[PDB]
C-alpha cells in the first residue's frame, strides 16, 4: 500500500516528496550488520514490522569491512533478499554500503561502483529502492570536499546510468554528522539527500541547530541511522532526548531508520535474546529501545 500510494520518490525544494509532489516521511528500522544478524532480515520479519510496527522503510546495513562484503561478498545476497521482501511488501528499502572502520569511502570505491552497478541494474526500475552509498565517513583526514563529494561523484554516475532518479543518500563527515559542510558544497544530482546520524546519549541541541542550518541551504536530509543509546550502540537508553529528536524530525519532515533490529546485548538493540527471527514479538521480547521505537512508528501510522 505505501509504495503504491506514494510511488516514485523525489526531492523538491530540499524535501522528500511523493509522485504528486506532496511531502512524505518514512520511518522504519535498520538491520544490524548483515554478516552478523542476517537471520532477522527476511520476508516474515519485515512483514511483521510493516503490520505490527507500521514501518514503511527498511534499511539493509551491509558492512563492507568487519567481516562484511569485502571479506565475504555472499552478504550481497541478503541485501537482495531484503530488497525483494520490500518490493513484495510494498515498502521502501535502503541499500546501505555500510562503511565504518574503512573510514574513507574511497578505500573500497571500485568495489562500491561494481556493487551499485549490480544493484541498480537489478532493481533500478522499482520505486522502492533508495541507495545509501557510504554509511559513516569518519576521521579528520576524510572531508566532504576532498574525499566524500568526489567519491559520490564517481558512484552516482554508475547508479544513474541504470536508475535515473531514485533517491541516493550520501554520507557526511564525522560519522555522518557534518551536514553543514555538505550543505555549503552540494552535489549536482537533484535526487540526492545527505545522511545525518544521531545517538540520544549525546546532548543534541547544537546538532539539531546544525541540521536546521543544512535544511536552510536547501539540502535534503535523511536520518538514515539513529539510536536511543549512546554513540557506541550501548551505554544505556536515553528516551527523553530520543523524544526531543523524534519531535524535531516530525517538525522538519525528516525520514528515519532506527538502529537496530537485533537481539544483541546492547542498549540500541530492538529485541531481547529470545526474539523469533521471523517476527511475532510479544511485549516481553522487545527491549526498552524496541518498545519505544515501535510506539513511535505506530503513533505515526
Active-site residue numbers? 136, 225
The response to whether 69 counts as a known ligand-binding position is no
Long-range interactions of 42-47: CB distance < 8 A, separation 24+:
42/81, 42/85, 42/277, 42/278, 43/81, 43/84, 43/85, 43/88, 43/89, 44/278, 44/279, 45/261, 45/277, 45/278, 45/279, 46/82, 46/85, 46/86, 46/89, 46/91, 47/85, 47/89, 47/279
Q: At what angle do helices 205-216 and 239-251 cross, to 10 degrees?
A: 10
The response to whether 77 counts as a known ligand-binding position is no
Judged by DSSP in three states, 154 sits in helix
Instruction: Point out which residues pair with 191 in neighbouring strands.
Output: none
The response to whether 36 counts as a known ligand-binding position is yes
The response to whether 263 counts as a known ligand-binding position is no
The response to whether 131 counts as a known ligand-binding position is no
Q: Name the phi and psi angles at 270, rounded to 5.
A: -75, -20
The response to whether 266 counts as a known ligand-binding position is yes
Contact 22, 7 (CB under 8 A): no
Strands 10-12 and 15-17: antiparallel
The response to whether 247 counts as a known ligand-binding position is no
Beta-carbon contacts of residue 240 (< 8 Å; ≥ 6 apart): none
Give residue for cell 583526514: 141
The response to whether 259 counts as a known ligand-binding position is yes
Cα(86)–Cα(92) distance, rounded to whole angstroms?
6
The response to whether 199 counts as a known ligand-binding position is yes
The half-sphere exposure of 220 on its side-chain side, counting CA atoms within 13 A, is 27
Give residue for cell 543509546: 229
The response to whether 232 counts as a known ligand-binding position is yes
Contact 219, 191 (CB under 8 A): no
Annotated binding site: 32, 36-37, 63, 98, 199, 231-232, 259, 264-266
Annotated binding site for substrate: 32, 36-37, 63, 98, 199, 231-232, 259, 264-266
Amino acid at each position: 500500500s505505501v509504495v503504491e500510494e506514494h510511488g516514485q520518490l523525489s526531492i523538491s525544494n530540499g524535501e522528500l516528496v511523493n509522485e504528486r509532489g506532496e511531502q512524505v516521511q518514512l520511518k522504519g528500522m535498520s538491520s544490524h550488520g548483515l554478516q552478523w544478524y542476517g537471520q532477522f532480515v527476511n520476508y516474515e520479519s519485515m512483514k511483521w514490522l510493516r503490520d505490527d510496527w507500521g514501518i514503511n522503510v527498511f534499511r539493509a546495513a551491509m558492512y563492507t569491512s568487519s567481516g562484511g562484503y569485502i571479506d565475504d561478498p555472499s552478504v550481497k545476497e541478503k541485501v537482495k533478499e531484503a530488497v525483494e521482501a520490500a518490493i513484495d511488501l510494498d515498502i521502501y528499502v535502503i541499500i546501505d554500503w555500510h562503511i565504518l572502520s574503512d573510514n574513507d569511502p574511497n578505500i573500497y570505491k571500485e568495489e562500491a561502483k561494481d556493487f551499485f552497478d549490480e544493484m541498480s541494474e537489478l532493481y533500478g526500475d522499482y520505486p522502492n529502492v533508495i541507495y545509501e552509498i557510504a554509511n559513516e565517513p569518519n576521521g579528520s583526514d576524510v572531508t566532504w570536499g576532498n574525499q566524500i563529494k568526489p567519491y559520490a561523484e564517481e558512484v552516482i554516475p554508475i547508479i544513474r546510468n541504470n536508475d535515473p532518479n531514485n533517491i541516493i543518500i550520501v554520507g557526511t563527515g564525522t560519522w555522518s554528522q557534518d551536514v553543514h559542510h555538505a550543505a555549503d558544497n552540494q552535489l549536482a544530482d537533484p535526487n540526492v539527500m545527505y545522511a545525518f546520524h544521531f545517538y540520544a546519549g549525546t546532548h543534541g541541541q547544537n546538532l539539531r541547530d546544525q541540521v536546521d542550518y543544512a535544511l536552510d541551504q536547501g539540502a535534503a536530509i535523511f536520518v538514515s541511522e539513529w539510536g536511543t543509546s549512546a554513540a557506541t550502540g550501548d551505554g544505556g537508553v536515553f528516551l527523553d532526548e530520543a523524544q526531543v529528536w523524534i519531535d524535531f524530525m516530525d517538525e522538519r519532515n525528516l525520514s528515519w531508520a532506527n538502529w537496530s533490529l537485533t537481539h544483541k546485548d546492547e542498549s540500541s538493540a530492538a529485541l531481547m535474546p529470545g526474539a523469533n527471527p521471523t517476527g511475532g514479538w510479544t511485549e516481553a521480547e522487545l527491549s526498552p529501545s524496541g518498545t519505544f521505537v515501535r510506539e513511535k512508528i505506530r503513533e505515526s501510522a
